[PDB]
Every structure is written in C-alpha cells, then in structure tokens.
Symmetry: C5
Subunit: 264 residues, 5 copies
C-alpha cells in the first residue's frame, strides 16, 4: 500500500471503544468457573501430555467494523488500553488455601502474569512454537492448532503459521506473534513467570499509546476492519486442596482513527 | 459541556487541601484497630463466601465544596472550577518501621516482629463528579449481607467474574464500596483522572515512596482538566500497605491516609 | 507568607554548606559498643503491653546550620534570605554491608556465610528553611515509650492516632529523640522544606543501595523557589535504615548508616 | 582502522536483512526430541573432575549473512562498505512459557500446577561487520569439555582464566559450538560490533520477558557510524536462556528461545 | 585548588586509555587455584573474637596509569568520559560446578548467587577513603598486607572523620571497612551499588554501547595531577556454594576505556 496524504476537515477522525472478556478456558459467562481456567492437570510424561478441556488460556480477539468510506482507509493513530478489575485481586477471603496453619489470609490470586495486546488493520499473524511438540489438544476440538506435530516446533519452524481469526480458540502456549510479518499490526507483551510470584499491575485512564510506525503511519484497516487482540493472565487461584486455576481479567480499548488517502 | 476561555487575573486560581483516612474495615476513629480491617476469614466454600463485618477494605471518598462562582445559574455562560494538577502523598509511611508490636516473630521467637507486609494496593482519583465504577469480582456468589452498609449490586450472576456492563455504580459514599468488587469504569470517567497499582503475593515487601515535590497534571490531551459540576470536587483513594500478622497467624489489612493538594482555575463554559 | 522577589547577583551571592549526620538507631553514643545499631528488638506480648526497651527504637537525625548573616537593616522595603537551590546527598559506608564474617546466624547448617545485614530499608532526607513539621501516626496507639523518657512523643494516647489526627503534630527540633515509627512529615505544612523518602519492607529483603558523588537534587519548587532560610538557619534531617543484624541466637538489631549533604544556597530578595 | 567518508545516495543504496536464530541449549538437532533444551544438567563431584556431559551446556547462536556484493581491491582510492544502521530484534515464543501442564514437578502436594520454566535468564545479542570477538573467562579453569569435541575451547587450561587473561581470545565463527559459560564478548575489541546482554541468576527466579514489534535499536556509535561489513559479511549472534524445565524427579534442563532480527544497512564510502 | 581555563583544540588534543582490573576477592594470585574467589568464609563466635582468615576478605582493585607527558598556565589531561563493563558475566551461566544442588541431589548446581557489590571510580588522584565498619573490633591481623587503621574505636561504626585513607594499593584495602569519602573526592567520580540478602539473584548487564560522562556540573572532568589517571573498582557477583555449604565470594574483572582531552589551567 502506497500511503498518500491525510484527509482533513470534519468527520476525518473517529474513535472505537470496546472491551474483551478473558479467555482462560471456561469462556461462557453463564456457566461455573467463568473467567478462570478449569483445574490445571500435569502430564505423566511428555508423550502423554494431553491437557483437559478448558484448562488452556487462549487469545481474546475481535474484528470491529469501521464506518464505510486513490481510496480512503482508516488509520489507527493511538490507543488507550487498560486492564479492568485489578482491584478484584484485593480478595483473600475466598475458599482457598491459607497462610499460617489455617489462621492467616487466603492465598490471593498470584503467580504467572502474561499481558499482551495488539491493534492492527488485519488479523494478528501467528508463529507456532511450543515447549512440547507432542502436546495433544484433542480433548477440545474447538482449539485451533496445527494438524501435524514435529520435533522442530520446540524452536522456530516457519512452516507453522496461522492468523488469529477466532476468539477463545488459539492457545497462548503454542502461538505467538510472528515477528517476520505483522507490518500492519502493533503488538506489546510481557511475561513474569515463577510459581507464586506477586502480580504487579497498573491501571489508569491517562496513558495514550501511539500506534504510528517510524514513518508516521499507523495500521491501515483493510476492508474497513480494525483488529484488536489481547491476553491478560494475572495468576492462579489456589483451592483448599491445592488445585489451581488460571485467572484472567478483561481489557478495555479506546482507539483513535483518522482518514488516510492511499494509492489504488 | 462546551468549554470556552480561561478566566485570567487575580483570584482566578484556588487550591484545595485535604486528607482521607483509610477505610480498611474498622473505620471508627474512637475504637481499637482503627485503620486496620477486622481479622480476615476464609470461606468454607465458594457458595458460602460471606466475609465478616469489617474485614473488607472500601474506597475512601469525599466531595469538597468549592467557592460559589455563578450568582445566576440560568445565564448564558457560567464559570466552573477546572482541576489543573494535584500533589498527593501517602501519609505515615514511617509508621511501618515498627517490628515490636504484638505479632508473629522471626527466628524461633527471638527475632523481630513481622512488619506489616504483603499485598499493596494504591489508587487515587480526582474529578468533577463521582468516580464511575464497574462491578467485577473474583467470586460472583460473594455474600455481603453481614454488613448492610456496604453498597453492592442487589442481584448476583456468573457473568460478573468478567466485565458485564449492566453492573455499574458511582462512588458516592465513603467507607462503603468494596475494592474487591468495584473498579473504575474505563468506558466512562471522562471528567475524572484515576491512577492505580497492585502488587500481590503473600508476604511481599511493601515498596513505598513519599515526597512533597511531585505534581501530577490533571489536564487531558486537549488541555482541559476535570470540570467541577455544581462546584463539587471529588477525591477518592485506597492505600493498602499489607497485613499485620498477629501472634497466632490471624491477619488484618493495614491502610494509610492520603493527602491531596489540588490546584484549580476558573474556566468559562457555555450554559 | 513570604513574597519572593529577584535573585541577588554578583560575587558572594552563592554559598555552600557541607555536613554529615550520624545514624540514630538507638545506641546513639559513639563511645559505646553497638554504636549505629539499635539495642535488641523485643516484641510485645499484647497490644496493651507494647513497651519498647530503651534504645531499640530508631529516631530521625537532624541539625540546624548557621548561615552567613545578611540583613543588618530591617527597616528597608526588602530583605535578603538564603535560598537552598540544590543538594548532593549520599549514604556513607554502604560497602560496610559487604561483611558476612560477623557473629551472626549463618547459612547451610552452620557451614555457610553469616547473614548479611538485611531486611527493612527506610531512607529519607529533608532540607528546609525551618524545622521539618511532623504528623503523629502509629501502628499502635497504645505504644508505651516510658522506658526511655528522652523520646519526644505526645503526652496522651488515643485510638484515632492509628490514622491521621491533625491535633497530633510536632516539629523536628532534636536529634536522636523523635521516633520514626510514630512521626512522619506533615504534608499539610512543610511549604518551606523539601523531603524525599522510601520504604522497602519485608523480613529478610535484600537491601538495594546506591552511592555516587555525581547526582544533584534540585530543591526549587514549581515556581523556581527553593527553601528560604528563616533567621539564617538551614535545617537538614534524615534517617537511613539498611536492615537488621541477625545474632547467633536470632536476636536482631536495626543497622543505620550516616548521610552526607552538600547544599548550594543563593541570595534571594524578599518583601519586608 | 577504517576512515569513514560520506554516505552513498541514490538507488540500491539501502538494504535490509531479516533472519531468526534458533537456540543452542545443547540438544541442537531440530529432528530430535528435546530440541531447544539442554540435556539433563549434571554436577561435578569436585572441581578437578568437572566434566559436563555432551549436550548439557548452552552455546552462542551465530550466523554470517552475505550482503549484496561490493567492489574490493587494494588500488582504488575509496571503497564502498555496507554500514549497519539499526536493528529490530525480539525473542520469539515468549507465550510458550504459559504452560504448566508439562511432565514436571508440581506445586502443593501433587495437586497444583506443574512448575513453569523458571530460574536463570541470560539474554544477549550482537550485530557487527566481523565475527564477535570473545574473551575466555570461566568459573572453573579445570572444566573438562572433552565429552563433546565439537565445542570450541582453548587447548590449554590455566588458573589465571578464572580472571581476565588477554592471551585467551577467540572469534565467534561457529554456531552451537562456543560455550556461554567460558566465552564472553571481549570489551577491549569489538569496535566494529554492537552487543547488549543481561543476566538474572538465582535458583527459581521468575523470568521477566517482553516482546514487541515497535522498538528500533540504533547501531550507530557516538560518531554516527554503524558496524562496517568487512568482506560484505553481516554477523549476528545471540543467546536467550529463559530458565530450566524441572522434571518429575528434579532433573533439570536449560530452555532457550529463538531470536528474530531485522537489520537496516546503507552504503558508506570509506578510504582505501 | 585548580583554576580551569579553555580546552586545547586541534591535532593530538585527545587521547584514550584502555585497561582492565582483575578482581581482588582474596585469593589474588593468578597462578593458584581459587583465583578470583575469596577463601572460604568463616563466622565469628562473638564480636570481640571477629578475626577473618587470611584471604576471605574482598579488597578494592586500583591502578594509576601514566599519561602522555605535557608540560602563566599548564596543560592537564581531563577525563571526559568512560566506557566500563563487567567482563565474564556469561561465566555465571554454569550450574555443573561442584556445588550444592537443587531438588534432592537431582537438580542443577546452585549458580553463583547472593550479595552483589559494584563500584568504579575514575579520578585525577587516588580515591579518598572514609573508614566505616559494621564491627569496630574486627581483627585484621591474620593478613598484615591489608591496610587498616592501627587503632580501633567504638565510633568507627559510624562516620569518624579522623579515620581516612587514600586508595594507593591494589588488593589491600578491605571493602568492608573503607568507602569513598564524600567530603573529598572533588577530582574523582565514583558510582556504586549494593544488593544484599542471602541467595539473591545477581542482576547484571554488559554492553559496549554505554558511555558514562565524567564532566561535573560545571563541564569539568577529573584533572590528572602529575599526568596520573586513577581507576578503582570492586565487582562482587555473589557466592559459590560448595557441596558442604562452604561459601566463597566470586568477583569479576572490569574493563575501562577512558577518553581524555587537553585542558589549560592556571599555574
Ligand atoms: C559435571 C560432571 O562432571 N558430570 C559427570 C557426572 C556427575 O559426576 C554425576 O552425574 C552427578 O550429577 O557423572 C557422569 O557419570 C556418571 C558416573 O560417574 C556414575 O557412577 O554412573 C552414571 C551412570 O548412570 C553416570 O554415567 C554422568 O552423569 O554422565 C559423567 C559426568 O562427566
Ligand atoms: C571470623 C572468625 O573469627 N573466624 C575464625 C574461625 C571461626 O571462629 C569458625 O571457623 C567458624 O566458621 O575459626 C578459625 O579457627 C578454627 C578453630 O576455632 C577451630 O576450633 O578449629 C578450626 C579447624 O580448622 C580452626 O582452626 C578458622 O576457621 O580458621 C580462626 C578464624 O579467625
Ligand atoms: C496434561 C495431561 O496429560 N493431563 C491428564 C491428567 C493428569 O495426567 C493427572 O490428572 C495429574 O494432574 O489426567 C487425566 O486423567 C485427567 O485429569 O483428566 C487426563 C489428562 O489428560
């Protein structure tokens, strides 16, 4: 796409506001354990590594329809994004394991944190890479994973790619952003691991993330579609007996877009 | 609100100074355990999750009356106070340098008492109207009925473990809205600025700063600060600095007060 | 209160003050053992019998420094005041914490290192043109300080002092006497002082410390005005707790370090 | 050594190189199980019998990339060289660490999560116009590498190599062969290479990782000159250890992740 | 003392100095085993019998470098900036040494871990030291090569300005009782950090892309008196934990690339 000048004047700007609910594994808002995974299980061996249905976090994603419009395209300029419900983690009276010989607080949601978001003018492009090439996803046929397994996928094998085109279906554990593509998407992510690690989270309505690239051009929304993707794991809830479930939080987005003239 | 020009000259600026005491659960300044929660308890099961009265931190909030500007409210333009900036600090951080209280102690009862430690949660908001809240909870079934002074939704549903926009409120009462189930609504709060952080874990070291030298700008991207509707300035916060661990392992939230110095200027608006 | 006018320019319009303050951890006599540490920490049996032993309570370090006298003529329109512009401040003796051979508890079944000084860190300093203004606030309103009557504490106790009760205030006017645990900077005053503090808590937390002679802290406020030294007095306060020393039997003592200050001041005309 | 003149302008004066490098943790064959991990870690009985097993030691990843061929000769007054201006680099597959169902040790009496990959992190990359220059330095001068004759290590051992002995140098000229544990970037050379590295140690330390496609790292030095590609070769090197996988019985293996690079280069006139 | 005038411009007005300093953790002989480590740490039975063994005490590394000879005015070399790095960080990626190990003797060997102490100084004269110790009674007589004060006093657990020195000898001034004197060192820049605790993860960086500016607030760098450049450092990266729980400090070398320029001063 050859990018030309900005379209100026009234109605040259628009904003899109949305939220995405977490996809930790139990993704149905009407059912038990919503916003958590099912109980985590552990493989007996690497050749019998078959996660139960609903114990695997997936990416959240949506395509948003923009106002219908050389051609003109919507250009994403900036985004204000926040994790919602951080204060919900200030809760140590739930039915959990507890400190100091059953006299102390319940364990707060704690441990692994994974936070990412992406804003682009087309689906986020994915690279397959896994800690175990033999992982068997057949307990849940709604998960999108490659049809074949190979040893090489514990590293970067460029023959194993995808696009994030379905909410609550692409496991985070085996799909990551493809850094060799995504020219029309901006993504940002972080991971803090360990077993019981303190979550460290911020929330504010005052921070704007600029989406323009080094040439001053933001994602250009092909077919008037804006693509938003994320995942926000804030830790594990530790049940009385030591059973553990991922806990995720929703993410809010306020995206500013402007009209851009392009060739063709 | 259509915003017009700043009013210039003498008396076009004013400052508001206040503090808010913490609302950790024992919120009566004449009683023992003020500025702490009651002892934390743990639910027998998620269907019988009924916190005891006073064990739940709530937001601190106040509405401050500003100097009246408009004699006639029906005139063509009005003047409003616009919050430009705030200097805010947590008070009494040094109070956490105390390891001789009646607490669990280190090294086979020969070492220090456990300092207040663990979960930290720090947030403040300054706006021209009440902070707008979104309901979201770790347990949709939580039963708040041991304390009918707590403001919570009148019905519960599974969906509130995520973001369900049908469950909203406004922070209109001090010491009443639980932090654990209410957060700032990011889809609103156009006229409020809020800032918050959480550091979790069990025994985590608190990491705290205090200074009188930092100014937080409240002007938005268009150079407009919160506009104080009906000459009311709204200030909200929560500052949990950890748990006090009693001899037997019983634990209580500890909170600290927060100080605010807010600078405001006169702004002409269309009426 | 003070209407600030223009800077005085030219020779002798600038001066610098250099000092250090030794730590006041509880054993504050430089001729005795355990100097720069507290006495052994003790733990209350209950909150109504919370009576710290003499010398187990850290206090603020403070000093007033006399500046060159300026105004002989008090009848003119204007006076001159010293204005603190900036300070270079450092914790001294950080390297002293590189010591794991002292008589302490030790790692790995009595074969490993002695425990280094570790745990709670508390670091604050203040530079102002009058005494640091204090607010009382305590973790335990019933704390009984009467084992050491040299501590400056309020004469009455009340439940409300576990929060901010503005009836309980003081000024930091004595070195080694105001407990850190119950006095903090009063944020509703101190217009003429700049203070900076941090706390890192927990039980055995690694101290994280920096020392350099290359960092200048600007004391000017948002209007470009530094602390103005009333009666030609410069007030410097601090506290620097770097952790606990853990004795063989588990007995623990606060350890503090000295702080150095190099303060630059300039002449400022004010309205009289 | 190289006198740098003006930029060459006009068509074909810019070029970009894009690649990835797979990790070399020890099992470096992409057709075998445990690819991108080390073999099980073993521990020497004593420092004079410290002989790591074949495949348990991480090595640097490296490649030399051919750039569009330029004219080299002794007789011209000036030549053109490729100058590396900037690089976008990222660790790939960070999300793969969101996995606690692998056959591992587990939390809370066999009812909790599997241990995630955790512990030691080591992250470094280099971009230069010639091989990364290495300095030998080891925690144990007697380490015996003879279980794997494909490793490049010095032919003689000496006590002094537990410090900096400048007689022990090399160049990173082979992928998956130079152990991280005994080779580091030589800071006394590498004038024509930019390298960046970090280490976070400890036993079970949480990995702290970031990934984004929005960060450009400028390779120009303080004089505005990037690495100059001798013999039209661009050299890219890295190592990204993200922790250990802890097997059921406590057996542990290094885990590494691939790194992506997008390097921008421009034609530079130099004196010949 | 020194009135600083203008920079000398033109050819040969700049020079660079490059060196490294090997660590002085206690076993400071490069021909012997345990080089770049301390001897085994021992622990006093009481504070009045606190006598570290010979070789268990880290000391500062230091060197004086001779600059090109120059000389009403004189010319001095002015240190403008330094690129400095800890060398051999990657050496800490080693968990197969003869050490204590994780998970019931099946896991990794403990990496070097715990206390970190990192400092460097660049100046135009010896680094000026202040004595300060955690234990005034520490007895250094097991190693008479250590430079320590000849008398002990209670006051030295704080700042006693009567106890000073200059860092004039490599591998001799213990870190545990000497620190930079902040009341002097007008002609030296120093930078230091300490991360304590028992088993703390070391957190270390290495790059050849970071320049530290040595100019002060007035735009003046250290001025090299008698054409001498003084470089000092200490870089402790943790402890090696032996099979039996015996522990030794581990240190790493530091590299320096210092840029200097000619400065006219009043004579
Ligand atoms: C770093 C090192 O020297 N590793 C040794 C290794 C260790 O000494 C041992 O594994 C402790 O972790 O021992 C190796 O040889 C072993 C024999 O010494 C043992 O008696 O028999 C084993 C057979 O199951 C084993 O082969 C090893 O683990 O492979 C050799 C290695 O250099
Ligand atoms: C820091 C200190 O004072 N170190 C002592 C050391 C310690 O008291 C002890 O090793 C605890 O780690 O003791 C030294 O002398 C030892 C004798 O006290 C012991 O009875 O026998 C030991 C056998 O080697 C040894 O002689 C020491 O370990 O060298 C002396 C040292 O200054
Ligand atoms: C990753 C994996 O293979 N998980 C499997 C688990 C675990 O091996 C054990 O529960 C120990 O957690 O066992 C199952 O019978 C189960 O719980 O449904 C099958 C499941 O596929």
């Amino acid at each position: 796409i050859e990018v030309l000048n900005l379209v100026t004047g009234p109605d040259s700007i628009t904003t899109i506001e949305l939220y995405l609910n977490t996809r930790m594994g139990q993704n149905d808002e009407s059912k038990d354990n919503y916003g958590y995974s099912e109980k985590v299980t552990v493989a007996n061996s690497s050749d019998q590594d078959k996660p139960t249905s609903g114990e695997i976090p997936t990416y959240s994603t949506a395509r948003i329809n923009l106002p219908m419009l050389t051609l003109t395209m919507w250009e994403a300029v900036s985004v204000k994004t926040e994790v919602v419900g951080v204060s919900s983690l200030v809760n140590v009276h739930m039915a959990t394991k507890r400190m100091y010989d059953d006299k102390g607080i319940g364990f707060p949601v704690e441990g692994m944190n994974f936070h990412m978001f992406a804003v682009g003018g087309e689906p986020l492009e994915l690279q397959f890479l896994t800690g175990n090439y033999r992982t068997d996803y057949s307990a849940n046929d709604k998960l999108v994973v490659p049809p074949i397994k190979h040893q090489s996928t514990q590293g970067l094998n460029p023959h194993y790619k995808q696009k994030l085109t379905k909410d609550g279906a692409f496991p985070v554990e085996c799909w990551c952003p493809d850094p060799s593509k995504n020219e029309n998407t901006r993504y940002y992510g972080s991971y803090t691991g360990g077993q019981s690690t303190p979550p460290v989270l911020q929330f504010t309505n005052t921070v704007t993330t600029v989406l323009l690239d080094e040439n001053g051009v933001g994602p250009l929304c092909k077919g008037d579609g804006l693509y938003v993707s994320c995942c926000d794991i804030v830790g594990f809830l530790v049940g009385k007996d030591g059973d553990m479930q991922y806990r995720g939080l929703p993410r809010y987005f306020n995206i500013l877009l402007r009209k851009r003239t392009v060739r063709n």
